[PDB]
Ligand binder design. Sequence first.
Ligand SMILES: Cc1ccncc1NC(=O)C(C)(C)c1cccc(Cl)c1
Ligand SMILES: Cc1ccncc1NC(=O)C(C)(C)c1cccc(Cl)c1
Lengths: 304, 304
Amino acid sequence: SGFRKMAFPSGKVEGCMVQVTCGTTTLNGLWLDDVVYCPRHVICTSEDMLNPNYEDLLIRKSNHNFLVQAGNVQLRVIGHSMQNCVLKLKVDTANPKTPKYKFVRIQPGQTFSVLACYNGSPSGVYQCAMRPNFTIKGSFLNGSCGSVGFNIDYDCVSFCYMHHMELPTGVHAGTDLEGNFYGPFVDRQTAQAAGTDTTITVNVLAWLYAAVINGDRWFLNRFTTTLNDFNLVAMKYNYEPLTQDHVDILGPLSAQTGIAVLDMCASLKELLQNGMNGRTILGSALLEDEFTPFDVVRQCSGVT
Amino acid sequence: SGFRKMAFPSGKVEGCMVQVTCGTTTLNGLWLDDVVYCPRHVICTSEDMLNPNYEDLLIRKSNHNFLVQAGNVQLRVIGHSMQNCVLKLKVDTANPKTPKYKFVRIQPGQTFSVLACYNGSPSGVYQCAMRPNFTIKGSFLNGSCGSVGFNIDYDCVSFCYMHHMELPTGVHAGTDLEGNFYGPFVDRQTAQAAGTDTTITVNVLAWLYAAVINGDRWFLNRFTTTLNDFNLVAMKYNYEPLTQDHVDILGPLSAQTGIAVLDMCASLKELLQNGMNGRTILGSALLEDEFTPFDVVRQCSGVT
Ligand SMILES: Cc1ccncc1NC(=O)C(C)(C)c1cccc(Cl)c1
Ligand SMILES: Cc1ccncc1NC(=O)C(C)(C)c1cccc(Cl)c1
């Protein structure tokens, strides 16, 4: 039936996007109830970004200096405060389009959808993973700051990411909705290199199970391995070490396909050592790691 | 700044999805104004699908036999008609969430977003291309029929695809919103093999330009080629022949990067003849063909 890098339907999040302007700077904000959330660097000019004292910069700003526009209507700002790297603008009107929501701080290796926005307007939606080094490989241009990452469960949106910065290497860094950066990144125009980015082993295995479920079985072999043997191979190829918690989460996929987790590890071991030999798996020539076991079950079962 | 397989924000389409039930069969419908559009095979049982006479099957059905549910509210059906492979159910209420829309029949090689649905509820959104053989490589399970493909321009949704069938090979076939199938496919449970699927050359070149724009330049070489020389290579590797119309559409990308189209063709020629030698381009180990020149410009400029 096919397997695609699917994002959640973005409707509930589109109705939350606003444009926030402070002085010369314009970026995106997230309007939930009577609060607009946005990156605190909205108060900076490019000149301030080298070494900004956000507390001192925010002191020269009043409620009337933050211009919030939802589509074509202007929101009245009645309060402002800084929480970590985000500003919280209290407005006099609750967003009538506020969905049921939560703020969650996701773990590395977990996935989420991103609704890229510019001037408070959505341009597109794509599926991302929080890398083990706490960066995301997204698609963001200047003006995209404040665009959010999220997951959906039935009718509840769990916001997990707010975009803040592009690193000199082209990868992206941002915060949870409490303004805490994922990783060691600071909201300063300083050289900040992302550490070693490893491959999310449990996600590659989940995607290998998805491949078997959809007919791609050429990589299955007559071998097995042990967690310690597999992890010697995973270390050599900069793969996250596989644990019993990882084996446990792959249980439903192992149950559906009848392929024991350690047997799937032996297929992955041989793919790591030998490569794909010019072949593909689910339309890909590399081992895909941005699908969790939960994503595979969801897509393969039709959860709406 | 990064490059992702981005889909359009799906909000405007989510507000159009309904569940349509006829007898034992449940599938998705598209509610625009006072009309619900859905695949005509909603009137079939699996037994009928072998060789259905849709005209005779529809004769045994009245307005009250089509149950249309939008979320939790029931729509009253006051008319029904068959247009090609789609049924048009006239309801007594115009969808208050109907966006500005058009029905368009796209060309092969063009891209579009798909909002996969089950029981009238959205599960996810992904970007697709209409293959040169008029199939799409999507992700659809039973119950997904009636899910639509679309493009957005400012505030106007151009619906181009409605999902109808999974071929025995795992690829997907469907219609435009007038019920005309893309390709030679019929809505019958018969062996229908998709013809030879070629690579969309103009899209690969557009994606090569996107790679250069984002720093991936290892594949650039000191060579050039001619359209006739390049097309001898394209035929050998089952690539669509490149034409002057294709060169013309790549003009803005050639203007921005300063790399002449025929010089980019020579890079592609060498990638075809030599492979990637274990390297990647925009996180991919194969030549990507599901991004049009328009998609690359849009994503690289921040069009919302
Ligand atoms: C230009 C761009 C592109 C994609 N995402 C983001 C950006 N923007 C940035 O990175 C800027 C605004 C310049 C920045 C600089 C230093 C620290 C922080 Cl928090 C932010
Ligand atoms: C099961 C499924 C999965 C993904 N997309 C679609 C389907 N469904 C089908 O293909 C069915 C309904 C069985 C079918 C059969 C023959 C012709 C037509 Cl038009 C449709």
